């Protein structure tokens with residue numbers, strides 16, 4: 531069971547990941563968690579973030595270049611993710627492929643139906659073979675942040691990459707857990 535937690539609010543997602551983990555473990559399930567990008571473990575992620583902040587020449591002049599680097603990080607985790615799914619009942623990912631679609635589309639001033647999102651879907655899911663999540667959970671509601679939120683919500687509405695669930699900060703974790711993996 532592979533669950534991706536998505537959204538624009540990082541502190542909010544983290545708290546959600548942890549409380550969801552606790553709900554599943556209260557039910558007696560084994561849970562592993564993994565956050566993307568894997569800053570500090572993946573040199574591709576690190577380069578991408580550094581570039582975004584002005585390093586590595588003109589790299590951040592291209593939104594695709596940076597999406598590609600985040601995609602390669604995830605590609606380097608395909609094996610780790612499969613191992614986690616064998617070893618554990620529930621694998622929760624704090625941000626995953628939809629994130630790359632939403633942020634990239636937002637930086638390009640595109641929406642969910644545009645070139646960048648479609649490209650992320652082919653590159654990460656078809657070409658690199660990243661496992662499709664069983665659930666993508668959007669934790670809903672800074673011009674960028676807002677644009678990204680909007681792309682996220684369109685992606686959720688279209689069932690991009692699989693089945694979605696949209697929730698607020700008020701969500702009860704045990705209630706969400708029960709919706710996600712009903713006993």
Ligand SMILES: CCCc1cc2[nH]c(=O)ccc2c(C)n1
Pocket residue numbers: 566567582593596597600601625626627629630631633634637
């Ligand atoms: C930097 C260019 C657009 C972009 C792509 C991203 N992809 C991811 O997988 C995770 C985060 C992320 C962010 C913040 N921004």
